[PDB]
Design a protein around this ligand. Structure first.
Ligand code: ZN
Ligand code: ZN
Lengths: 100, 49, 57, 49, 43, 49, 98, 62, 215, 182
C-alpha cells in the first residue's frame, strides 16, 4: 500500500533508464544466428501449446517447420531484447531484421 | 585436519573432504551430471545415409 | 583369421528413464543396472563453445 | 533432446553442416576419406566412357 | 595475534587502523584513486 | 554518488577486487608483527598453535 | 645473435654492433620488467606461435591475441591457476576449479 | 686438442634423406622428411616434411 | 687516455637525448634539433675544459606547446633536473623541493646517477600540486618506445575519455589496466586514471587502436 | 564466459573487458576463407552477388559515410609511412574504432583494405572496378563475428586441441608442451 509505492516507483524508473530508443539504437541490423535459434525455438514452443498460427500450414506436424514457415514471411510476433553488458538494452522486432 | 589414531585407508571423511578432488561434488555431479534419455553404442560405417 | 575375445555384444546400452539417487536425484551407473550416460567436464565446455544454451539447459 | 528450444539448436547451431570448417584456423573437417578418393580418380580419368 | 590482551585493543595505532578502515570504505565503490589520495591528505 | 560512477550498492570490479587484496594482505602483516602496544606499553607473548 | 641468459640493460652498452631497438627475448616476465605491458603482450603472441609453427600446426592469431590480452589483463603477467584467478568476480568458478 | 673432431660445422651437415614431394607453396620437388611413429598400432608413420628453398613445411598424416 | 671518459659521455649524450624525447613525447615544447643534439655538440657545449662533462648546464625548464594546453588545460612548466652528486643526500633534496616551490612548476623530473638516500625517497609525493618523477641515467640509455614491439602510446584527455566510457557504456574500471610504476607509464608520466590509447599492429588487421587505464 | 557482446567488444561475462574487437578485425574464422580470395570472387560475381543480397539491404544501413572515411586515412597513411612508429602522427583514428562494421558499409580492416586496393591495380579484366569494391566490402560485413559468440571456448579449443599432437622427439630450446606450460 505505501512501501510498494516506494518499490514500483524506483523499479520502473530504473527500467525506464536503460532503454535505448529507435533513433539511438546502433547495434547490428542483422539476425545474429542465435536470435534465429531462440526465435525458432520459442515460436515453435508456443505453437505446440495452441498459440495462434499466422500462416497457412498445409500438413505439417512439427512445430519447428511451422515456425520456419512464419519466419519466411516475417509473421513472428516477438521482440528481441538485446542486452548490453552495462545493463542497457535495445528492442528489436522480427519484422525489422533480415533473415540470412 | 584431524589427528585421530592411525591411517585408516583414506579415513572417514568430514564435509570438506566431500568437496575436494576430481570426485566429490562439483566436477563429479555438478559439472558432470549424468543424463536421462541417452545411450552409447559401437559406431559403424554406412555410406547410404 | 582369429576371432577375438572382446566383442560388441556386451558393450552397447540404452537409457531413457529410471533410478535416481538420494543425495543427487540423479541417475545410476551400471551396465547390468540401467547405466546412465555421463555428460562430463569437457562435454559441458563444448556446448558452450557451440553457443547453444538450450542444449545445455 | 527433449524440448523445442533445443531441437532448433541441434538443427541450426551445433549441426554438422555449419561445422564444416574447424574454428581453429578455418580448415575443413568434413570430407570423404579412403574409398571414394582413390575411386574418384578413375571416374574423372579420361578413359571413363 | 594483534589484539592486546591487556589494553583491550590492538597493539596498533588509532589512525593506522583508521586508514585501512577508511580506504576499504572507498574500495567498496567504483573508486580506487581516492583511496590513494586519502593517503596523501594528511598532516 | 552525484555521478553515475557508483551507487550505494557499490561497485565490484576485478580491478577493485585486485587492490582490495593489497590493503588487507598488508593489513594482515603488520598486525601480525608488533613489538609492544601503542596506546599502552603492555602486551602478550607469542601465541603458538 | 642468440644470447643464452637474459640481461637487457647491459646489452644497451653495445649498440655499435647491435640494433638495440630490435632485441627480442622470450623471458616474458623480463620483457615486462623493462619494456612494459603492451610489449610483454607482444612476446606472448610470438612465443606461443613459435611452438606451433615448429610442428607445422597453424592456429589463427585471434586466439593468441585473445589469450595474451586475457593473461595480461591486469597490467601484470598473470596465468591460469589459483593465483591468476585470485582476482575474479564469480566464486563458483573458483570453487569448481581446485 | 682431441685427435678426433669434436664440433660440427655451421653449414656442413646436409641431410640427404630427400624424397620428391610436390610442394604446393613454391613448386619445389626435392624436400626432406622427418617421419615418426605417434599413435598405437592402428596407425603408421605420420609423415612430416621440411623444404630448403621456400622454408615452409608440408604434412601427410598417414 | 680518454677511454673511460668517452662512453661515460656517450651514454650521457644518449641519456640527455631520451629525456628531450621524453619531454617532447608528452607534448611539451622541446624543439626538433634540441632532441637531435650530436655528441660533438654535446661535448662542445655542456662539457667544460677539463675533458669531462658537467650536468648543471643540462638542467632546464620545459613548457607546454600550443596544443598541449588546448587539449590538457591543467598543464604548466616542467623542470628537468640532473644532478652532480652520485649519492643523493636528503639535505640536498631540500634545494630540489624549494626550487619547485619557488619557481612554482608543475612537475620536476629529477634524474640521478647511482642512488638516492632511502630517507630521501619519502619527499617525492611531499608536494600535493607538484609530484616528483625520478629516473636513473642507466634507466634512460635507450628510449624504450622505439622498439618494434612497443606500440604507439597516446594519452587522452578527460573529454574523449568521457566519450570513451560512453561509447561502450563502461564502468570506470572495466578496462585492461596498466601498472602504477610501469616504465612506459613512467615515461609518459601518468597519474592514476589517465587512460592511454595504444595503437598496436594486430597481425590480421594492421593498425588497431586499443586502450588501457592507469591505477 | 568470454564472449563477443553486441557492441563487438570482447567482454568477460562479469562486465570486464579484454579486447575491443575480436582480435582487431573481428572476423569469423569459419567465414574468412574466400574473404581475401580476390581472384575467385571476381570469377563468380553473378552467383555470389545474389547471396550477399543488396537489393533488399541498403535501406537498413549506412553506405557512403565510411567509404569516404576509409579513403582519407589510407591517403593519410601513405604520407606517414617511412616514419618509425614512435614518430607517427596519430591524428586519424582507424575506421574500425569509430565505425561499427555491422552497421557501416566499407568500414573494414586496414590490412585487408590494403590488399583489396592493391589487387585491382594489377588487372586487365563485364564487371567494373567500382561494383567490385562494394561486393568485397559487403562480404566483410556479412562475414563478421556474430555477437554472443563463444570466443573463450574456441580460444582454448584451438590450443588444447592441436597440442595433442606435439610431444614427440626433437627435429637448446624448451619445446612443445613443457614450453607451453611456462
Ligand atoms: Zn594498549
Ligand atoms: Zn617449397
Amino acid at each position: 500500500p505505501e512501501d510498494f509505492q516506494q518499490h514500483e516507483q524506483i523499479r520502473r524508473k530504473t527500467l525506464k533508464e536503460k532503454a535505448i530508443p529507435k533513433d539511438q539504437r546502433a547495434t547490428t541490423p542483422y539476425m545474429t544466428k542465435y536470435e534465429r535459434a531462440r526465435i525458432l525455438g520459442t515460436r515453435a514452443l508456443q505453437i505446440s501449446m495452441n498459440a495462434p498460427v499466422f500462416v497457412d500450414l498445409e500438413g505439417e506436424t512439427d512445430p519447428l517447420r511451422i515456425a520456419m514457415k512464419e519466419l519466411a514471411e516475417k509473421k513472428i510476433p516477438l521482440v528481441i531484447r538485446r542486452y548490453l553488458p552495462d545493463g542497457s538494452f535495445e528492442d528489436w522486432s522480427v519484422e525489422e531484421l533480415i533473415v540470412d | 585436519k584431524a589427528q585421530g589414531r592411525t591411517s585408516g585407508k583414506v579415513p572417514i571423511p568430514g564435509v570438506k573432504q566431500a568437496l575436494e578432488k576430481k570426485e566429490g561434488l562439483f566436477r563429479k555431479h555438478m559439472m558432470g551430471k549424468r543424463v536421462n534419455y541417452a545411450a552409447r553404442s559401437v559406431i559403424s560405417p554406412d555410406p547410404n545415409i | 583369421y582369429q576371432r577375438l575375445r572382446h566383442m560388441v555384444n556386451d558393450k552397447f546400452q540404452v537409457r531413457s528413464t529410471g533410478p535416481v539417487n538420494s543425495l543427487t536425484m540423479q541417475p545410476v551407473k551400471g551396465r547390468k543396472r540401467h547405466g546412465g550416460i555421463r555428460v562430463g567436464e569437457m562435454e559441458r565446455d563444448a556446448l558452450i563453445g557451440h553457443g547453444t544454451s538450450f542444449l545445455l539447459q | 533432446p527433449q524440448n523445442e528450444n533445443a531441437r532448433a539448436e541441434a538443427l541450426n547451431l551445433a549441426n554438422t553442416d555449419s561445422q564444416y570448417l574447424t574454428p581453429t584456423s578455418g580448415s575443413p573437417v568434413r570430407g570423404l576419406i579412403q574409398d571414394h578418393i582413390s575411386a574418384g580418380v578413375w571416374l574423372t580419368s579420361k578413359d571413363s566412357f | 595475534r594483534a589484539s592486546c590482551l591487556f589494553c583491550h585493543h590492538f597493539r596498533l595505532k588509532s589512525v593506522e587502523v583508521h586508514r585501512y578502515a577508511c580506504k576499504l570504505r572507498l574500495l567498496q565503490y567504483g573508486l580506487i584513486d581516492e583511496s590513494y589520495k586519502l593517503d596523501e591528505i594528511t598532516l | 554518488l552525484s555521478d553515475g560512477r557508483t551507487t550505494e550498492r557499490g561497485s565490484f570490479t576485478a580491478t577493485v577486487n585486485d587492490e582490495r587484496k593489497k590493503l588487507v594482505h598488508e593489513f594482515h602483516k603488520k598486525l601480525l608483527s608488533r613489538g609492544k602496544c601503542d596506546n599502552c606499553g603492555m602486551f602478550s607473548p607469542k601465541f603458538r598453535k | 645473435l642468440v644470447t643464452e641468459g637474459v640481461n637487457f640493460q647491459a646489452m644497451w652498452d653495445q649498440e655499435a654492433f647491435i640494433d638495440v631497438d630490435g632485441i627480442t627475448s622470450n623471458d616474458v616476465a623480463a620483457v615486462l620488467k623493462t619494456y612494459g605491458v603492451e610489449a610483454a603482450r607482444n612476446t606472448i603472441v610470438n612465443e606461443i606461435n613459435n611452438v606451433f609453427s615448429r610442428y607445422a600446426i597453424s592456429v589463427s592469431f585471434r586466439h593468441l591475441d585473445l589469450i595474451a590480452d586475457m593473461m595480461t589483463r591486469q597490467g601484470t603477467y598473470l596465468a591460469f591457476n589459483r593465483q591468476g584467478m585470485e582476482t575474479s568476480t564469480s566464486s563458483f568458478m573458483k570453487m569448481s576449479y581446485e | 686438442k682431441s685427435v678426433v673432431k669434436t664440433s660440427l660445422k655451421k653449414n656442413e651437415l646436409k641431410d640427404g634423406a630427400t624424397i620428391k614431394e610436390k610442394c604446393p607453396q613454391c613448386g619445389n620437388e626435392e624436400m626432406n622428411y622427418h617421419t615418426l611413429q605417434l599413435r598405437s598400432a592402428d596407425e603408421g608413420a605420420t609423415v612430416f616434411y621440411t623444404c630448403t628453398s621456400c622454408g615452409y613445411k608440408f604434412r601427410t598424416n598417414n | 687516455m680518454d677511454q673511460e671518459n668517452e662512453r661515460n659521455i656517450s651514454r650521457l649524450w644518449r641519456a640527455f637525448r631520451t629525456v628531450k624525447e621524453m619531454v617532447k613525447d608528452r607534448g611539451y615544447f622541446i624543439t626538433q634539433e634540441e632532441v637531435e643534439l650530436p655528441l660533438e655538440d654535446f661535448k662542445a657545449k655542456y662539457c667544460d675544459s677539463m675533458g669531462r662533462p658537467q650536468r648543471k648546464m643540462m638542467s632546464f625548464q620545459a613548457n607546454p606547446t600550443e596544443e598541449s594546453i588546448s587539449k590538457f588545460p591543467d598543464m604548466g612548466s616542467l623542470w628537468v633536473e640532473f644532478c652532480d652528486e652520485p649519492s643523493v643526500g636528503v639535505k640536498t633534496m631540500k634545494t630540489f623541493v624549494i626550487h619547485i616551490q619557488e619557481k612554482n612548476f608543475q612537475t620536476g623530473i629529477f634524474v640521478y646517477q647511482n642512488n638516492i638516500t632511502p630517507s630521501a625517497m619519502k619527499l617525492v609525493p611531499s608536494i600535493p600540486p607538484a609530484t616528483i618523477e625520478t629516473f636513473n641515467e642507466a634507466a634512460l640509455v635507450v628510449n624504450i618506445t622505439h622498439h618494434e614491439l612497443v606500440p604507439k602510446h597516446i594519452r587522452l584527455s578527460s573529454d574523449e575519455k568521457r566519450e570513451l566510457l560512453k561509447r561502450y557504456r563502461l564502468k570506470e574500471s572495466q578496462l585492461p589496466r596498466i601498472q602504477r610504476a610501469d616504465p612506459v607509464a613512467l615515461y609518459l608520466g601518468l597519474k592514476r586514471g589517465e587512460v592511454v590509447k595504444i595503437i598496436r599492429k594486430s597481425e590480421t588487421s594492421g593498425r588497431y587502436a586499443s586502450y588501457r587505464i592507469c591505477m | 564466459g568470454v564472449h563477443v557482446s553486441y557492441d563487438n567488444s570482447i567482454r568477460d561475462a562479469d562486465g570486464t573487458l579484454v579486447q575491443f574487437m575480436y582480435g582487431g578485425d573481428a572476423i569469423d574464422i569459419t567465414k574468412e576463407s574466400h574473404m581475401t580470395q580476390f581472384e575467385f570472387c571476381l570469377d563468380n560475381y553473378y552467383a555470389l552477388l545474389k547471396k550477399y543480397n543488396p537489393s533488399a539491404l541498403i535501406e537498413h544501413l549506412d553506405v557512403e559515410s565510411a567509404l569516404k572515411y576509409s579513403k582519407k586515412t589510407l591517403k593519410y597513411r601513405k604520407k606517414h609511412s617511412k616514419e618509425p612508429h614512435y614518430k607517427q602522427s596519430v591524428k586519424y583514428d582507424p575506421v574500425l574504432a569509430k565505425y561499427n562494421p555491422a552497421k557501416y558499409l566499407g568500414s573494414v580492416s586496414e590490412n585487408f583494405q590494403d590488399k583489396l586496393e592493391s589487387f585491382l591495380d594489377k588487372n586487365s579484366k563485364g564487371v567494373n572496378e567500382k561494383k567490385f569494391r562494394a561486393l568485397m566490402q559487403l562480404k566483410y560485413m556479412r562475414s563478421l563475428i556474430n555477437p554472443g559468440e563463444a570466443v573463450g571456448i574456441i580460444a582454448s579449443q584451438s590450443v588444447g586441441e592441436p597440442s595433442t599432437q606435439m610431444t614427440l622427439n626433437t627435429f637448446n630450446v624448451t619445446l612443445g608442451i613443457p614450453r607451453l606450460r611456462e
